[PDB]
């Protein structure tokens, strides 16, 4: 298993999975830890502004490695 706990920073892990491209997105909405990041629904991902299907997909599934071992 991979270990997703590792980044030190929401900026790191976007970068980590080429979505750095969203980063300001994050910022302005307040997602500044990882925490945040892992409780985050489709819903939350979609309020970003987030709206290629492949994107979504990523993050979400990003997300949810990350959740299992951060949760």
């Known amino acids: 298993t991979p270990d997703f706990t590792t980044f030190c920073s929401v900026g790191e892990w976007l970068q980590a999975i080429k979505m750095e491209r969203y980063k300001d997105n994050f910022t302005a909405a ?30 979400m599934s990003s997300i949810q490695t990350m ?5």
């Open 30 to 59: 307040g997602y500044n830890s990882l925490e945040s990041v892992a409780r985050m629904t489709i819903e939350d991902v979609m309020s970003l502004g987030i709206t290629l299907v492949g994107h979504q997909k990523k993050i």
């Open 67 to 71: 959740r299992a071992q951060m949760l």
